[PDB]
Symmetry: D2
Subunit: 160 residues, 4 copies
């Protein structure tokens, strides 16, 4: 009945597109669905904490979460909802700009029925990209931005 | 450099969404992209024959083809473009409503670097679905339409 | 339920290994399994639950009827691949097929691709290109034989990418 | 050039078979290969097969550093049971950054469905990550987890289907 699926990848790999592909497959079969997005990324409920939308999620069969890395309560929420019989689909970055685990996201992997890591195209050499390189000098993890602030990159380009 | 990727599956499995996900990964990395759709499905560039858009395709790096099953020249076109260095990504039904090969699309498989078959949700029992059942009694292969005319189904529901 | 899974790819892509991985997953969970291999392929690397050589899948239908999971190696060489898989899946067996999608000419190998529309699961594995070492999707024949069926391994064939193929 | 590939899954999902499928693809194309196994897992079902012994280096270890010299001499390195190597991250990154293809089979989770050792730190480092499924040994649906049958509390308890079942979420929780 209930499950957690995780869609990992670097930026620009289409994780949110894959999330919506999966959600729509259920939606066309008449399942009730909810998608949650992280509220501070303004580049289908916005939220900063998943507990903020837990009431609405009780009333659906399928929950999609975009930018899962930003929710500090990702684990508790996904596990509770999957154990209550919901299908929970999470798109998230696996790694920060430092190729370190992004928040609590990887704690989901041992809890998950399905895990995939998508690839992007390296913006610097056009081979396949598994990582995200920050272009500026900000040292904090959370810096909202797109291709003006980040490049998807392969290993060689990450370290160039 | 050139290649053919094929995205197979029944109706309602999100083939065209996956096509666009893959194409957009190249587009954001500044490749020139062209997408082609079958002109008679009205429910990028429309076409009934790929030869008609061959010129525009010569001028891009990445060509996506939606509803590839409907193009009678799909094999010749994809092979020529890939052999000219283009990445050709094709979304198509693998089977008709009779679970027979749809057009010439399966002749791409031995030519292709990548082949995947997506699944839909069975609209009748909600297990995974690999096939498309026609709801009405029309016998002709090409009948354009959505969930009002077809259901994604599993094997058991396909056979009643 | 009743399913067909198809594992495609060129030579040297580990199709037979993937087939056995999938079968063993069921076997360890106490399912009765049978693996069928093409009897004319007597290569050592393509040896060795019930495990049975056949030239026609019908020839071991009696054994196949009494199991839950049937793996078939080198699907492309069985004249009855389509009919057998479909009948077995409709009888409730899980049928897992490893096969070449393409001949040395990159044309469909027998009737194998007619399984695709009947199948719940289809993947195409990759090999390593034996000529440039990028990923390979095709098999190139090394000698001048013109007939489709020539049994052999890396002695007679290479896995290749598109550029090396035409090379 | 170099890369890390990770094959996750519960027990009985065929992770070491997938590892060997991947490594053999390179071996048959004449790459020099080494496969490393965790020395303390002495089960018959986990031992190197004879054909692999004859075509690649196959080495037991309890620390990856202990086979670093051998690993430096090859192009492709496969690691079975990567969760048990405390230096998994350092080794895999060093080797991939020196041009090697590193392929790791590992459990993602312990019997408690918590991260197994340091293994998930590879995920952000890896070019490729898959999670395989097993068959639930209790209800026969797809299984993503491993349940311990006994009452042992320690994470590391070597054993097979006699001590562990692959299970789905429902069977995991009883
Ligand atoms: C790599 C990285 C990204 N970010 C930010 C940048 C973006 O605002 C955001 C990207 O999150 P994503 O999860 O990549 O957003 P998305 O769901 O749109 O992904 P996709 O394009 O694949 O569909 O996270 C950080 O704050 N810190 C980082 O270290
Ligand atoms: C099965 C079948 C479909 N069709 C038609 C119906 C549709 O108009 C068309 C299917 O287009 P698709 O793009 O395959 O349908 P879809 O939009 O549901 O696909 P997806 O979600 O996977 O992207 O093919 C036939 O004409 N004959 C048939 O045998
Ligand atoms: C390509 C090709 C192969 N063959 C033969 C050669 C082999 O005997 C047989 C292929 O069997 P496979 O099982 O495809 O060969 P393999 O063992 O290398 O594959 P894998 O690593 O994926 O398990 O087909 C032909 O007869 N004609 C052809 O055109
Ligand atoms: C789940 C779990 C396993 N182990 C042990 C048991 C085994 O000795 C080892 C796991 O071996 P694996 O190779 O993960 O198990 P397997 O041989 O069933 O795997 P596969 O079919 O995927 O190839 O780890 C623990 O110590 N703690 C745990 O919590
Ligand atoms: Zn690069
Ligand atoms: Zn159904
Ligand atoms: Zn090549
Ligand atoms: Zn179960």
């Amino acid at each position: 009945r209930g499950q957690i699926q995780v869609i990992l990848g670097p930026m620009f790999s289409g994780k949110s597109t894959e999330l919506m592909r999966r959600v729509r497959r259920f939606q066309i079969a008449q399942y009730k669905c909810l998608v949650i997005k992280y509220a501070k990324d303004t580049r289908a409920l916005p939220a900063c904490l998943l507990r903020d939308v837990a009431q609405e999620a009780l009333g659906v069969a399928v929950i999609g979460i975009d930018e899962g890395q930003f929710f500090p309560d990702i684990v508790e929420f996904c596990e509770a909802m999957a154990n209550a019989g919901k299908t929970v689909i999470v798109a998230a970055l696996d790694g920060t700009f430092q190729r370190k685990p992004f928040g609590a996201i990887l704690n989901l992997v041992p809890l998950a029925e399905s895990v995939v890591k998508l690839t992007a195209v390296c913006m610097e050499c056009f081979r396949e990209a598994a990582y995200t390189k920050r272009l500026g000098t900000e040292k904090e993890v959370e810096v909202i931005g797109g291709a003006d602030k980040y490049h998807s990159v392969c290993r060689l380009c990450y370290f160039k």
